[PDB]
Amino acid sequence: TSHCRFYENKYPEIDDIVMVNVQQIAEMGAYVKLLEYDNIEGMILLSELSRRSIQKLIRVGKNDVAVVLRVDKEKGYIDLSKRRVSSEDIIKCEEKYQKSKTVHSILRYCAEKFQIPLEELYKTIAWPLSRKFGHAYEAFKLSIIDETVWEGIEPPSKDVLDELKNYISVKIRADVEVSCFSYEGIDAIKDALKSAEDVKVKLVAAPLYVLTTQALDKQKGIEQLESAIEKITEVITKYGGVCNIT
Amino acid sequence: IINRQATINIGTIGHVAHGKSTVVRAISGVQTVRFLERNITIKLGYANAKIYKCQESFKSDKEISPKCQRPGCPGRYKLVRHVSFVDCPGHDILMSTMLSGAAVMDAALLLIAGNESCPQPQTSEHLAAIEIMKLKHVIILQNKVDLMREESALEHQKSILKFIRGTIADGAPIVPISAQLKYNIDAVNEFIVKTIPVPPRDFMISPRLIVIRSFDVNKPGAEIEDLKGGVAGGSILNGVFKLGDEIEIRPGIVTKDKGKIQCKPIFSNIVSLFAEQNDLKFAVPGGLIGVGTKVDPTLCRADRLVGQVVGAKGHLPNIYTDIEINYFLLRRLLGVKKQAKVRKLEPNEVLMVNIGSTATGARVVAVKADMARLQLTSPACTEINEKIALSRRIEKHWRLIGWATIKK
Numbered sequence A: 001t002s003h004c005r006f007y008e009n010k011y012p013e014i015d016d017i018v019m020v021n022v023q024q025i026a027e028m029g030a031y032v033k034l035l036e037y038d039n040i041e042g043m044i045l046l047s048e049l050s051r052r053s054i055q056k057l058i059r060v061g062k063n064d065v066a067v068v069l070r071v072d073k074e075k076g077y078i079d080l081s082k083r084r085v086s087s088e089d090i091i092k093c094e095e096k097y098q099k100s101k102t103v104h105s106i107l108r109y110c111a112e113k114f115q116i117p118l119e120e121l122y123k124t125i126a127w128p129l130s131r132k133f134g135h136a137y138e139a140f141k142l143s144i145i146d147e148t149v150w151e152g153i154e155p156p157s158k159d160v161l162d163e164l165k166n167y168i169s170v171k172i173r174a175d176v177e178v179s180c181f182s183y184e185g186i187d188a189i190k191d192a193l194k195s196a197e198d199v200k201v202k203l204v205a206a207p208l209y210v211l212t213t214q215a216l217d218k219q220k221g222i223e224q225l226e227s228a229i230e231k232i233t234e235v236i237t238k239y240g241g242v243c244n245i246t
Numbered sequence B: 001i002i003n004r005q006a007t008i009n010i011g012t013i014g015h016v017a018h019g020k021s022t023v024v025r026a027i028s029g030v031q032t033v034r035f036l037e038r039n040i041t042i043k044l045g046y047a048n049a050k051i052y053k054c055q056e057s058f059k060s061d062k063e064i065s066p067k068c069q070r071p072g073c074p075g076r077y078k079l080v081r082h083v084s085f086v087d088c089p090g091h092d093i094l095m096s097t098m099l100s101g102a103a104v105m106d107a108a109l110l111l112i113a114g115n116e117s118c119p120q121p122q123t124s125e126h127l128a129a130i131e132i133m134k135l136k137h138v139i140i141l142q143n144k145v146d147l148m149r150e151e152s153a154l155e156h157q158k159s160i161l162k163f164i165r166g167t168i169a170d171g172a173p174i175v176p177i178s179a180q181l182k183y184n185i186d187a188v189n190e191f192i193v194k195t196i197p198v199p200p201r202d203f204m205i206s207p208r209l210i211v212i213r214s215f216d217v218n219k220p221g222a223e224i225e226d227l228k229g230g231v232a233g234g235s236i237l238n239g240v241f242k243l244g245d246e247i248e249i250r251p252g253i254v255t256k257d258k259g260k261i262q263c264k265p266i267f268s269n270i271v272s273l274f275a276e277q278n279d280l281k282f283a284v285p286g287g288l289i290g291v292g293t294k295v296d297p298t299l300c301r302a303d304r305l306v307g308q309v310v311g312a313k314g315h316l317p318n319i320y321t322d323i324e325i326n327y328f329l330l331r332r333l334l335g336v337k338k339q340a341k342v343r344k345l346e347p348n349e350v351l352m353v354n355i356g357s358t359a360t361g362a363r364v365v366a367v368k369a370d371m372a373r374l375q376l377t378s379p380a381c382t383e384i385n386e387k388i389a390l391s392r393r394i395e396k397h398w399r400l401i402g403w404a405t406i407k408k
Helices: A087-106 A109-113 A118-126 A136-145 A158-168 A186-196 A221-237 B021-027 B096-104 B121-132 B152-163 B185-194
Strands: A017-021 A029-032 A042-045 A063-072 A077-081 A171-178 A200-203 A208-214 A243-245 B009-013 B047-053 B078-087 B107-112 B138-142 B174-176 B208-216 B230-238 B246-249 B266-275 B287-293 B308-312 B318-334 B350-355 B360-367 B371-382 B388-393 B398-406
Touching (some): A042 A063, A063 A087, A109 A118, A186 A221, A221 A243, B009 B096, B021 B047, B021 B185, B096 B121, B121 B318, B121 B398, B174 B185
Parallel strands (some): A042 A077, B009 B078, B107 B138
Antiparallel strands (some): A063 A077, B208 B230, B230 B287, B266 B287, B360 B371
C-alpha cells in the first residue's frame, strides 16, 4: 500500500509548490491527487488554471505545477493556482519534484522486504535525513560517498539497508590462440597465465584461451589487453614455438 | 591380483555396419574410444580384455569376470594373460589407419555376417593385407547367426572353407558367436590360448616405438593453474621402457614460416605412462600405452601425429626423402566390387605407399623389373627393413596392388 507525506507534514503551507497528476476534468476544474504533499486531493477552479486550446492541454495523465493559496487544516482541503507561478522558479520546482520522487522510490524496497508499514519507515528515515540536512536525496548521496547520516538513527533492519546500498551501487572479451611445436610448452603457458590473469581467464578446449578483462572507465581495457598480448608474444619466441593473436 | 599390462596385440577386422565395436564390448566391457579433443586422432580405438582360466569342460574354460561364480566351481581364477584390442574400421574410404594398426598386430580376428552376401571384396583385401604383414594366426568369426537358417549357416561355412585354401593361413579355426546376445565367447577365449603363442622378446634389442593416437588432458570448468601434459598414445613392438627417459619423435616439425628449416626431432621427457587403467613404472612391449610426455597439449590435438616413429636418446636412425623399394605385384585387384587386371607401373604417377604406419604419397622415377625408386612429398624414416603395403588410384578411391621391402 502506497501512502504517507513526502516532506514533513500531511497538509501543505502557504506559497509552497505542488505537482499534480490529473485523472478527470471539466466539472469544477481539477480536484486531483498530489505528488509533492501526500495523496489527499487538491482542487483548482476553472480560472486560476489558465495562464494564456484550454480543454486539450491537460485532460488525463499529464502533470501540472501549481502554487498553494488556501489551506483548511481540519481533514484535507487544499487550494491550488497555476497562473501565479513564474517561469524562473519552474525548473527549481521540477527539480524538487524529481528529488521527492527519488526519495519515494528509495522508500519502497524496505516496504517490500520486511512486510512492515511504509509510513513508519518514512518517519524513521525523515528524522536524521530530511530534517537536519535539508533534502533526503542529497543526504543519501553523502552517505553513499562517506557514511555519516545513517549513524544518527539505529537500524531495525540492517539487511534492508545492505540491499538498498547494493541497489545504489565492464567485461571485455579476448581470444589468444596457442599452437606451439617446441620441446616444453605447458610451463610456458603457465608462465603466460601468471602474467595475463592478474581478471577472469577460463579454459575451454586446447588451442583456444578465453579471457575477460574488467575495465573501470570503459576505455581502460585496451591498455592491459595489449600488454598481455605483448607478454604472450615475448613468452613463446625464445623456446621455439608459435602463438597467434586474431 | 597383480596389475600386469598388455602382453600381445590382437586386432579385429570386418566391414561397415557389420559389428566390430559391439563384439569388442561383448569380449571385454570397457566401451571403445570412437563410436573433438579426447580420443579423436585416428580410426582405431582402445580396448582391453582379460584372460583368466579356471582349471580344476568341453569348451567352457575361460571367463570374463575376475570372480568364478557362473560355471560351478567357487575357486579363484588363475592368471594367464592380459591383452589389448586394436579395433580397425573396414570402410572403403579409410584404410590407412587399418594399415597402421596391422604393423603392430600379432594376432588377427576376421568378422563376416551371415545374412549378407558370401563373397565380399573388402574382407578379402583385409585378409590379403594380413597375409602380407607377417601374420599367420587368424581366427574366423561368424557374426549374425541368430537371424539365419539351420542349413544356410552350414552352407556359408562350406563356402568359406572352399574360399580359404590357397592362402598362407592353413589351419584357421572357425567360431560362430553372437554380439548382441552375448554367447559362445568362452570358446573364443580358449582358442586365443590354444592357437596363438607369444613370440620371444628380450631386453637386448634397441627401443622402437610407434605412435598411433594423440591425447590432450584438459577439463572444462577447472582453472588453468591445474594443467596436465601432452599424452602420446603409442604402441611398442621392441624395446622395454621405464619411467625417466628422453624420447624423440623422428620425422620433424615446422615451427617457423622465409628461412630454411634446421630444427631437430621433437625431444620430450616421459612424465607418466598410461597402461590399461592405472599408471605403471615398466613398459612391456606388445601393447598400446598412452605415453604422457613433456610435449605440448596443443600438438596432441587431432590429425597431426598419425603413424610416426619414436626413439630413445642414444640411438640414431636414418631419414629418407628418396626410397629404394623391391616390389611384387598381384594378378587381379582386390577391393573392387567385378574384378580388374593389374597394369604395369607407369613413370610419374601419384601413388600411396604405406611403410609400416606412415601414410605417404610417392611418385615413381625409374622402373626396371623388381627394383623401384620413389620420391616422397612428406618425410619418412627407415630403421631396419619394414613391411610395406602399396596402393594405387584407378577409379575414384585407393586400391591395393601388392607388397614391397626396403633394400638398405
